[PDB]
Structures are given as C-alpha cells and as structure tokens.
Scaffold this active site. Structure first.
Site, PDB file in Angstrom:
ATOM      1  N   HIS A  89       0.662  -1.493   0.350  1.00  0.00           N
ATOM      2  CA  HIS A  89      -0.111  -0.072   0.155  1.00  0.00           C
ATOM      3  C   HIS A  89       0.676   1.564   0.405  1.00  0.00           C
ATOM      4  O   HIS A  89       2.121   1.175   0.566  1.00  0.00           O
ATOM      5  CB  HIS A  89      -0.906   0.131   1.342  1.00  0.00           C
ATOM      6  CG  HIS A  89      -0.185   0.347   2.610  1.00  0.00           C
ATOM      7  ND1 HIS A  89       0.059   1.607   3.428  1.00  0.00           N
ATOM      8  CD2 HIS A  89       0.499  -0.506   3.550  1.00  0.00           C
ATOM      9  CE1 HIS A  89       1.257   1.875   4.383  1.00  0.00           C
ATOM     10  NE2 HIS A  89       1.038   0.678   4.564  1.00  0.00           N
ATOM     11  N   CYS A  90       0.245   2.306   0.240  1.00  0.00           N
ATOM     12  CA  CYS A  90       1.131   3.535  -0.148  1.00  0.00           C
ATOM     13  C   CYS A  90      -0.289   4.263   0.435  1.00  0.00           C
ATOM     14  O   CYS A  90      -0.601   4.103   1.323  1.00  0.00           O
ATOM     15  CB  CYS A  90       1.228   4.238  -1.461  1.00  0.00           C
ATOM     16  SG  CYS A  90       0.129   4.624  -2.999  1.00  0.00           S
ATOM     17  N   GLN A  91      -0.963   5.548  -0.020  1.00  0.00           N
ATOM     18  CA  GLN A  91      -1.222   6.224   1.073  1.00  0.00           C
ATOM     19  C   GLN A  91      -2.833   5.846   0.341  1.00  0.00           C
ATOM     20  O   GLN A  91      -3.873   5.621   0.989  1.00  0.00           O
ATOM     21  CB  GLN A  91      -0.636   8.141   0.396  1.00  0.00           C
ATOM     22  CG  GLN A  91       0.002   8.175   1.045  1.00  0.00           C
ATOM     23  CD  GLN A  91      -0.013   9.456   1.523  1.00  0.00           C
ATOM     24  OE1 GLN A  91       0.784  10.443   0.934  1.00  0.00           O
ATOM     25  NE2 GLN A  91      -0.685  10.789   2.407  1.00  0.00           N
TER      26      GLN A  91
END
EC number: 3.1.3.16
Length: 147
Positions: A89-91
């Site tokens: 994931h990232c943001q």
C-alpha cells in the site's frame, strides 16, 4: 472509500486504511507488508505480527520507483514461497503501490505492460500511476523483453 483489492490470492493492493485493518490482514493470511511511502507509519509494527518493508518513495514526477522493483518482488516472492500473503500500500493505493504491483505482474506473470495495467485497473478502478511511473513501466517492459 475504495476497498482492499485482491490481485492474486497472496497479493493485495490497498491504501493507508487497509494497512491499519489488523483483523482483515490476519484473516487473509497476510504475513508481509510493503509500505510505499516515506512518511506513513508501519502500522501495527509494535505487535510483531508481520514482516515489513518500507520503499520510501514520493509520488513525484522525479521519483525513481524502478530502483525498488527487485526488492519488492523478492519480498512478494518470499511471502508467496512460504504460503503467506502480502499487502502492499501507499496513501491511496492509486499511484505508487499500484505501479509496483503492475511491475510485479509484468515480470512474474509475464503480462505485457498494457495487460498488467488492465488487469489491475479492472480489479481496482481507481488506479492511476503518474506519468513518470508510466514511463518507468514502459522502460521496464523493454528491459524484460530484452532479458
């Protein structure tokens, strides 16, 4: 609002909220987490329930993500090889992490860049890697094709 996206039975693409969902991660047999940001915390690190990897990237027009491809794939394969799942994931799960997953599909499931992109976009309609990353994916496609 986008929900966590199963890409392969052992690979899930999501956002910052998903990375905080301890119960869901454990139900999905996830034992590995890749956090593709420089600033978010490694949620739940103190519990010692997962193996983590940070790829400290920004979503800028100058960020080199290609440099983290090999490390990310090795970690995904480590999870894969021991029967465990991995959450990346990232943001927003829109650009950074999506790029890494598309790249993983290109190398490990031998999909052309277009097919890998459509594969991920079909499952997670909100993805939209920035143009800098798209250029890196095209370059990566050429490198794969040239061995």
């Amino acid at each position: 609002m986008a929900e966590l996206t199963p890409i392969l039975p052992f690979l899930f693409l999501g956002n910052e909220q998903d990375a905080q969902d301890l119960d869901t991660m454990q139900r999905l047999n996830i034992g590995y987490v890749i956090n593709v940001t420089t600033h978010l915390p490694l949620y739940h690190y103190e519990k010692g329930l997962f193996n983590y990897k940070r790829l400290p990237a920004t979503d800028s027009n100058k960020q080199n993500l290609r440099q983290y491809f090999e490390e990310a794939f090795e970690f995904i394969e480590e999870a894969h090889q021991c029967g465990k799942g991995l959450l990346i994931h990232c943001q927003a799960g829109v650009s950074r992490s999506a790029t890494i997953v598309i790249a993983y599909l290109m190398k490990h499931t031998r999909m052309t860049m277009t097919d890998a992109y459509k594969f991920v976009k079909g499952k997670r309609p909100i993805i939209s890697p920035n143009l800098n990353f798209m250029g890196q994916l095209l370059e990566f496609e050429e490198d794969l094709n040239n061995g």
